Amino acid sequence: KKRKRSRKESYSVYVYKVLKQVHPDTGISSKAMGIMNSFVNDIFERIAGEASRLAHYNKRSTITSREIQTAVRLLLPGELAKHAVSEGTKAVTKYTSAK
Amino acid sequence: KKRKRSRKESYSVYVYKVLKQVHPDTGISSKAMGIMNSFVNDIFERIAGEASRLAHYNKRSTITSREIQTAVRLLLPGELAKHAVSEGTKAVTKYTSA
Amino acid sequence: ARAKAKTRSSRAGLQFPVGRVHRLLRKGNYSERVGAGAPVYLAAVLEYLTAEILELAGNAARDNKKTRIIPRHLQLAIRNDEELNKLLGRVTIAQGGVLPNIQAVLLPK
Amino acid sequence: ARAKAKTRSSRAGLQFPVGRVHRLLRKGNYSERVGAGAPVYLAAVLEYLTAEILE
Amino acid sequence: LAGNAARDNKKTRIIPRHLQLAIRNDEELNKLLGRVTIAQGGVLPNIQAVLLPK
Amino acid sequence: KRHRKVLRDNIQGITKPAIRRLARRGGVKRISGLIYEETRGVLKVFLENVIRDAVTYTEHAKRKTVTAMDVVYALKRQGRTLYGFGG
Amino acid sequence: RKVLRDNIQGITKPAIRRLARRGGVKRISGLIYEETRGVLKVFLENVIRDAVTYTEHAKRKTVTAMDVVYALKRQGRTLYGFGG
Amino acid sequence: KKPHRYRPGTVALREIRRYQKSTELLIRKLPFQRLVREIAQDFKTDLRFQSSAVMALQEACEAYLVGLFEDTNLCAIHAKRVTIMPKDIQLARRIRGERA
Amino acid sequence: KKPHRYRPGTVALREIRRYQKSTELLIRKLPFQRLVREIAQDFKTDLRFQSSAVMALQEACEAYLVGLFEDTNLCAIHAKRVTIMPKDIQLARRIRGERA
DNA sequence: AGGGTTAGGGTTAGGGTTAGGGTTAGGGTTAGGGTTAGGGTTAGGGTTAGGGTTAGGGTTAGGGTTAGGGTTAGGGTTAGG
DNA sequence: CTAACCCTAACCCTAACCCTAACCCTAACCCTAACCCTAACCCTAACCCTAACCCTAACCCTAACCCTAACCCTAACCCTA
Known part of the structure; x- marks a missing residue:
C-alpha cells in the first residue's frame, strides 16, 4: 500500500522491454512475468553464490568479471554458456570503451 | 628463500580428545582423522549457510542462538536434533550462569 | 556541478539494472569487494x-494461435529446449501441464 | 598485559575451538555481525x- | 519394417504404400535407395510451418 | 456454534476419481485397485515434511500465520523449486 | 603413439565383473561392458571438464585433489578422506 | 461405437489425450484444505494458513504425484505389463533415493 | 575324471561375499591414469594431474559403478530375473535422472 | 548517478622450491579370449478375474458476500552487542 | 485470515456388465558361468629434472565510502483489448 508502507522490488519494465525488442505486437501475462522474475532471481543467486565460492577458494577477496565468467561457464550448459560469455565480453569491452 | 611455511588448521587434537573421553583405549587412523575433519567442516559449513540464509530471509544482520537452533532443527533429523538442541541450551545456560 | 547524469544502462547498452545488481552483490554478503565489470557481465548473461x-515463449504462443505468453507455453518451450531443460531440471512451473507423450505399448492394436 | 587469557573452551566446558569457530564465522562472509552464543552452540552440536x- | 508399418496401419498384408513408408522412415534405407521410386506409393504427409494456417 | 473440530478423515478425503485422473495424465492406462491406498499413504508423508519446515520457518519470526513465502522456502530447501506462487 | 581404442579397452572385462560382484550381481550380460565403459567415460569427461575449468580459474596447470573434490561436490557427490 | 458399451481400453486413451492438454487442478480444494490443517495440528495449534499456501502445496503435491505415476508407468512396461501395481511404486521410489 | 567342478552359482555367491568383505580396489591405476590423461587432452594441452586426484577419481568411479550395478540388479530382480540387461541400466539412468 | 578521497587487496616479480613427469625394467600379476555346458529366459498358450465402461442419484464444492477478530509490520528509540 | 450460510451444479461413489491382461506352466533356446594358461602389464624401485608452484616484497590501483542530486522504479487507477 502507501500508508507509509514499503516499496518492493521487481524486474517488470526490463522484461517488458526485452519482450518488445525480441518480438513486437505480442503480449504477456502476470503469471508469466512472475515466473520470469523468479527465474531471473534464482539464476542471479546461483551465479552470485558460485562466484563467491570461487573467489573464496582462491584466497581472494574480489569477485570480478573473470569469476563471473567462470561461474557462467560452470553453471550454463553447452553453447548457451559460450553465447552468454561472448555477449558479456562484448558488454565489458563497450563499458571499457565508454562509461 | 625463508621457512615460515603455511600452517594448516585441523581439528585432530579435538577429535583425539573426544575419542579419549569416549573410548580411552581405542585409536584413530590417519584416514579416519581426515574423514572426521571433512565431516566436521561440511556440517559446520552447512549450518553456517543455513543460518546465513535465515538471516538474509528475515531482515536482520546478526546470527544469535535462535538462528543456530533453527538451523540445527532444520538440518538434523529427530532425536539427534533434540539432543543437540538440549546440549546447546545447557551450554549457553552454563555460560550465562558462570 | 554534476554536469549531466548518463544512466549506466545507457552506457552499457543493456536493458538490466546494473546499479541494482551491484547493490545486491554488495548487500548480499557475497564478498567485501565487488569488481565493476561483474554486474555488467551478470546483467548481460x-x-x-x-x-x-x-x-521461445513467443514462438510457442504464435504456434498456439494466441498472443499473450502463458505458463503453459513457457513450460512447453522449456521442455522442448534441451539446454533449457538441462539447466532447469529441478524447477516445476505452476499452472502448467506436461507434453502429450504416449508410449508405443499404450497405443491400441 | 591484558591480565591472563582464560581459555573460552574451559569457560564453555566444551572441547572445540570456540575462537576458531568465531573467526570462521567472521571471515567466512556469512554475515556482518556474529553472535557470541552461536559459536558455542555450533561447537556443542x-x-x-x-x-x-x-x- | 514393412510388417511393423502394416501392423501400425491396422492391416495384415504388406502393401507398396507401407513399403515406401518404411523406406522413407529408415534413414539408412533412404540413403541406400535414394534414386529408387516405388510404384503405387505416395509420400509422407509433411506440411511446412509456413503453410499452416495462422 | 462450531462445536466440532477437524477429524482424521481427511486422509480419505482424496476420492478414487481424484487419483484416477492424476494417473491418466501421466500415461497410466490401467490403474490398479490397491494403488488407491498406496497413493494416499505416499501423499501423507509428502505433506508432513514441508509442513514441518514451514512451521519451523514461521516460529523463527515469532509469528502465527504461515505465508506462501515460507512454503516456497521450504520447498526450495527440500529439493523442489516452485515458480509463480510467491516471490 | 597413443591409441583411442586402447583406453576404452583399459576398463577390462574381469574388472567390471568384479565390480558387479562387489555390488551384488550374479550374472553379467555381454552388452553391459560397453555401456558401462561409455557411462564411465561420460562421467569422467564431465568431472575432468569441471576440474580443468577450476584449474584455469586458479590460473594454473596442475589438477589437484582439492579441485577434484570441489568438482565432485559441485555435482552432489561429496567425498571424504582424500583432501580436507 | 454403440452408446451401450465401448471397447475397454479405448475410452481411457481418449481421456488421457483430453486430460493432458489442460492445466486445471484435479484435486479438490475444500477436501485438500482440511488435510493440510489436520497435519499441522500435531506440530503446533493456533495457525493462520494463507490463502496462497494451500494453493502452492496442492500444486506441488499434484506435480509430485504425476511424476511418481509416470515413473510407475515406466516401470510397469518393463515387465511386459501395461498396468501399475503397488509393488512397482516401491521400486520407483527406492531407485529415486527417497525411501532408499 | 571328476574334479568336483563348481556348478554355475557356487563360485558366483562366494566371490560376491569375498569381494564384499574387502576394502581394496579392483580397477588398475595405470590404465585409469592413461584414460583420464586422454580425456583431459580434449580440453587443455600439457596438463599434469595429481596422484591423489586420480585416486579419488577411481574411488568415486568405482562407487558410482557399484551403485549403478546395485540398481540394475534390483531392477532385474523386480523384472522376475537374475541377470542384468542393457535395458535395465537404461531404465535405471532414466529414473535416476542421469539421461538429462 | 555524480563527485571527490582513501586504504586495503591485487599484482607482478624473481628467487627459491617442490611435486609431477619421465625414465627403464622386470616379474609376479592379471587379463582374457579360448571352449563348454547348465541354468535361466521368454514368448506362447491359457484362463479367469480385475478393473475399464456406464451412469445417475445423492453429496458437496465453488464462488459470493459480508463482518470481525487476529496479527503484524510501521514508526520511534535506545542501549547494549 | 477466519467465521457463517446459499444455491445451484459439478463431484463423488456404489453398482452391475465386459472385456482383457497379467500371472502360471512350459518348452525351447541360449547365454553366461566356469577353468585356464599363457602373454601383456603395471606397479612397483630409485633417480633426475623440470617446469609449474610458492614465498616473500613493495605499491598501486580499484573498490569502498560518504554525501547529494538527478532519476528511475514502483504504487495507483481505470479501461479496453
Whole structure:
C-alpha cells in the first residue's frame, strides 16, 4: 500500500522491454512475468553464490568479471554458456570503451 | 628463500580428545582423522549457510542462538536434533550462569 | 556541478539494472569487494537468457494461435529446449501441464 | 598485559575451538555481525556429533 | 519394417504404400535407395510451418 | 456454534476419481485397485515434511500465520523449486 | 603413439565383473561392458571438464585433489578422506 | 461405437489425450484444505494458513504425484505389463533415493 | 575324471561375499591414469594431474559403478530375473535422472 | 548517478622450491579370449478375474458476500552487542 | 485470515456388465558361468629434472565510502483489448 508502507522490488519494465525488442505486437501475462522474475532471481543467486565460492577458494577477496565468467561457464550448459560469455565480453569491452 | 611455511588448521587434537573421553583405549587412523575433519567442516559449513540464509530471509544482520537452533532443527533429523538442541541450551545456560 | 547524469544502462547498452545488481552483490554478503565489470557481465548473461526464453515463449504462443505468453507455453518451450531443460531440471512451473507423450505399448492394436 | 587469557573452551566446558569457530564465522562472509552464543552452540552440536560417531 | 508399418496401419498384408513408408522412415534405407521410386506409393504427409494456417 | 473440530478423515478425503485422473495424465492406462491406498499413504508423508519446515520457518519470526513465502522456502530447501506462487 | 581404442579397452572385462560382484550381481550380460565403459567415460569427461575449468580459474596447470573434490561436490557427490 | 458399451481400453486413451492438454487442478480444494490443517495440528495449534499456501502445496503435491505415476508407468512396461501395481511404486521410489 | 567342478552359482555367491568383505580396489591405476590423461587432452594441452586426484577419481568411479550395478540388479530382480540387461541400466539412468 | 578521497587487496616479480613427469625394467600379476555346458529366459498358450465402461442419484464444492477478530509490520528509540 | 450460510451444479461413489491382461506352466533356446594358461602389464624401485608452484616484497590501483542530486522504479487507477 502507501500508508507509509514499503516499496518492493521487481524486474517488470526490463522484461517488458526485452519482450518488445525480441518480438513486437505480442503480449504477456502476470503469471508469466512472475515466473520470469523468479527465474531471473534464482539464476542471479546461483551465479552470485558460485562466484563467491570461487573467489573464496582462491584466497581472494574480489569477485570480478573473470569469476563471473567462470561461474557462467560452470553453471550454463553447452553453447548457451559460450553465447552468454561472448555477449558479456562484448558488454565489458563497450563499458571499457565508454562509461 | 625463508621457512615460515603455511600452517594448516585441523581439528585432530579435538577429535583425539573426544575419542579419549569416549573410548580411552581405542585409536584413530590417519584416514579416519581426515574423514572426521571433512565431516566436521561440511556440517559446520552447512549450518553456517543455513543460518546465513535465515538471516538474509528475515531482515536482520546478526546470527544469535535462535538462528543456530533453527538451523540445527532444520538440518538434523529427530532425536539427534533434540539432543543437540538440549546440549546447546545447557551450554549457553552454563555460560550465562558462570 | 554534476554536469549531466548518463544512466549506466545507457552506457552499457543493456536493458538490466546494473546499479541494482551491484547493490545486491554488495548487500548480499557475497564478498567485501565487488569488481565493476561483474554486474555488467551478470546483467548481460541474464538479459541473453531472458531474451532466449521470451523468444521461445513467443514462438510457442504464435504456434498456439494466441498472443499473450502463458505458463503453459513457457513450460512447453522449456521442455522442448534441451539446454533449457538441462539447466532447469529441478524447477516445476505452476499452472502448467506436461507434453502429450504416449508410449508405443499404450497405443491400441 | 591484558591480565591472563582464560581459555573460552574451559569457560564453555566444551572441547572445540570456540575462537576458531568465531573467526570462521567472521571471515567466512556469512554475515556482518556474529553472535557470541552461536559459536558455542555450533561447537556443542559438532562435539555431540563427533562423540556419537566416534562411539 | 514393412510388417511393423502394416501392423501400425491396422492391416495384415504388406502393401507398396507401407513399403515406401518404411523406406522413407529408415534413414539408412533412404540413403541406400535414394534414386529408387516405388510404384503405387505416395509420400509422407509433411506440411511446412509456413503453410499452416495462422 | 462450531462445536466440532477437524477429524482424521481427511486422509480419505482424496476420492478414487481424484487419483484416477492424476494417473491418466501421466500415461497410466490401467490403474490398479490397491494403488488407491498406496497413493494416499505416499501423499501423507509428502505433506508432513514441508509442513514441518514451514512451521519451523514461521516460529523463527515469532509469528502465527504461515505465508506462501515460507512454503516456497521450504520447498526450495527440500529439493523442489516452485515458480509463480510467491516471490 | 597413443591409441583411442586402447583406453576404452583399459576398463577390462574381469574388472567390471568384479565390480558387479562387489555390488551384488550374479550374472553379467555381454552388452553391459560397453555401456558401462561409455557411462564411465561420460562421467569422467564431465568431472575432468569441471576440474580443468577450476584449474584455469586458479590460473594454473596442475589438477589437484582439492579441485577434484570441489568438482565432485559441485555435482552432489561429496567425498571424504582424500583432501580436507 | 454403440452408446451401450465401448471397447475397454479405448475410452481411457481418449481421456488421457483430453486430460493432458489442460492445466486445471484435479484435486479438490475444500477436501485438500482440511488435510493440510489436520497435519499441522500435531506440530503446533493456533495457525493462520494463507490463502496462497494451500494453493502452492496442492500444486506441488499434484506435480509430485504425476511424476511418481509416470515413473510407475515406466516401470510397469518393463515387465511386459501395461498396468501399475503397488509393488512397482516401491521400486520407483527406492531407485529415486527417497525411501532408499 | 571328476574334479568336483563348481556348478554355475557356487563360485558366483562366494566371490560376491569375498569381494564384499574387502576394502581394496579392483580397477588398475595405470590404465585409469592413461584414460583420464586422454580425456583431459580434449580440453587443455600439457596438463599434469595429481596422484591423489586420480585416486579419488577411481574411488568415486568405482562407487558410482557399484551403485549403478546395485540398481540394475534390483531392477532385474523386480523384472522376475537374475541377470542384468542393457535395458535395465537404461531404465535405471532414466529414473535416476542421469539421461538429462 | 555524480563527485571527490582513501586504504586495503591485487599484482607482478624473481628467487627459491617442490611435486609431477619421465625414465627403464622386470616379474609376479592379471587379463582374457579360448571352449563348454547348465541354468535361466521368454514368448506362447491359457484362463479367469480385475478393473475399464456406464451412469445417475445423492453429496458437496465453488464462488459470493459480508463482518470481525487476529496479527503484524510501521514508526520511534535506545542501549547494549 | 477466519467465521457463517446459499444455491445451484459439478463431484463423488456404489453398482452391475465386459472385456482383457497379467500371472502360471512350459518348452525351447541360449547365454553366461566356469577353468585356464599363457602373454601383456603395471606397479612397483630409485633417480633426475623440470617446469609449474610458492614465498616473500613493495605499491598501486580499484573498490569502498560518504554525501547529494538527478532519476528511475514502483504504487495507483481505470479501461479496453
